[PDB]
Design a protein around this ligand. Sequence first.
Ligand SMILES: *C(=O)/C=C/c1ccc(O)cc1
Length: 124
Amino acid sequence: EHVAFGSEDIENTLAKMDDGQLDGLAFGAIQLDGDGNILQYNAAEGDITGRDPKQVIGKNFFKDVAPCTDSPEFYGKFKEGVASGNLNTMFEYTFDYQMTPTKVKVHMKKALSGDSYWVFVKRV
Ligand SMILES: *C(=O)/C=C/c1ccc(O)cc1
């Protein structure tokens, strides 16, 4: 898929893309509901983190999968965005739960329709 990390209209491009198409992206992509449950999780993300995508779909990202993100610096930003109904933030972070610590750039953006939220990830 021909989409760049951080693209201004990424929510339109990805809107309603199915799991197979998401697996074509150059960067990790996770779709979360407003509670942080995982709705979609692509192959590039699994390559970065070791998680098996179909296994983490339905789990809570903050509670279960990624406790290192349960902090004001990641989850706090996410929940503020869910509560506001608007989110577009980009920041670096280190992923380190049961994995070699890995520095990444994270872009969280509210999905176009409904109430879903993207978490995009690339190595830095
Ligand atoms: C910290 O616990 C981060 C873990 C993590 C981040 C992103 C993922 O897709 C999976 C686990």
